[PDB]
């Protein structure tokens, strides 16, 4: 199994595997059984504003999500990114559904890492700002059944069944380039994200949550993940 650290924006309670009774923002260290969770309001078809940081001046792996006119779910868990995740990664997006349908449209995505060439002397970066997902976006390694284009949207579901997105669908959105992390030039790699999603109400209890992972440089859909495994885990452990 690939080593993977994700932020589940889980839109479905999974009481069998440790997800709480409420839909929740989460955090993962090689585990769909989350370290820390928090209540997320989970509005209908609306928009987006998520944000994930890890500054090793404070070594807190934080994540916040806010709709407009809604609150913020700080779910910050201190975890040591020294040993829990490899030197070179391949970040990206992950979303899935199963037996209940939901729309998992991402409509903009960013990232900004800054890792210590020599702490003051001009640290490295990978800033991108995909506000204009094209029809043939050839710097995404979108796996599974992920779709794109036809608008400015990244549709991580098999969609356009009048927005009833064909349940037990799954699609990942891995970015094309690797990032240096492990420690080695120590671990202040304050990777940022901005993760404006859209989750449309299907009138069907919208469910199975979107993710944002930091995986191995090699990855695929693990052994079937349409459901509780949320797009990126092989097992429920």
């Amino acid at each position: 199994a690939d080593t993977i650290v994700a932020v589940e924006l889980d839109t479905y309670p999974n009481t069998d595997i440790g997800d709480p009774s409420y839909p929740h923002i989460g955090i993962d260290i090689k585990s769909v059984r989350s370290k820390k969770t928090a209540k997320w309001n989970m509005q209908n078809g609306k928009v987006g504003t998520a944000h994930i940081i890890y500054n090793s001046v404070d070594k807190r792996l934080s994540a916040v999500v806010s709709y407009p006119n809604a609150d913020s779910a700080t779910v910050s868990y201190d975890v040591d990114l020294d040993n829990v995740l490899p030197e070179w990664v391949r970040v990206g997006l992950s979303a899935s559904t199963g037996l209940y349908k939901e729309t998992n449209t991402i409509l903009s995505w960013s990232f900004t890492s800054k890792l210590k060439s020599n702490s003051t002397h001009e640290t490295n970066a990978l800033h991108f700002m995909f506000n204009q997902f094209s029809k043939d976006q050839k710097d995404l390694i979108l796996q599974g059944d992920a779709t794109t284009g036809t608008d400015g949207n990244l549709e991580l579901t098999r969609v356009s069944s009048n927005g009833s997105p064909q349940g037990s669908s799954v699609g990942r959105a891995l970015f094309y380039a690797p990032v240096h992390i492990w420690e080695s030039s120590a671990v202040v790699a304050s990777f940022e994200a901005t993760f404006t999603f859209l989750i449309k109400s299907p009138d069907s209890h919208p469910a199975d949550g979107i993710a944002f992972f930091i995986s191995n440089i090699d990855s695929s859909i693990p052994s079937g993940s349409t459901g509780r495994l949320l797009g990126l885990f092989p097992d429920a452990n």
Partner: protein
């Protein structure tokens, strides 16, 4: 109610649970029971006051067995609907013994129409020679 009012032929409460009641009623009091859909004839159910105008699956399962010999398949795949459906295909499941077939029997999940779990696995196993056993409603639902 109908036997007390007086009839000549009760035309087929048309389900396996509802037929076995009225069939043994008609065997008891005498009137013919005109079945119009296939049910499970129990081998020790000694009744004869009934006819069953649905074509028997002792004959039909030889006819599907005729086509898989005529089309010369060797990697057939049965997709059925209910647990009763293996009685509909008696002779088809019983014949890799007599020939060279490789029946790999699969079932549609109940209370749904998603073959999206099923057809994902049927494409995976390179099964191209599917023998469905649906109704005509659930035929077009899987074809879509």
């Amino acid at each position: 109610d109908q036997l007390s009012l007086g009839v000549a032929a009760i035309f087929g409460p048309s389900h396996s649970s509802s037929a076995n009641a009225v069939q043994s009623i008609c065997n008891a009091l005498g009137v013919p029971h005109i079945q119009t859909r296939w049910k499970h004839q129990v081998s020790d159910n000694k009744d004869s006051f009934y006819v069953s105008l649905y074509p028997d699956f002792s004959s039909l399962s030889r006819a599907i067995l005729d086509l898989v010999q005529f089309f010369k398949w060797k990697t057939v795949t049965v997709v059925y609907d209910d647990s009763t459906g293996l009685i509909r295909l008696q002779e088809l499941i019983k014949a890799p013994s007599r020939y060279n077939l490789r029946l790999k029997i699969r079932q549609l999940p109940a209370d749904t129409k998603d073959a999206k779990p099923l057809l994902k696995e049927m494409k995976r196993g390179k099964e191209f020679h599917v023998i469905f056993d649906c109704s005509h409603e659930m035929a077009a639902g899987i074809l879509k």
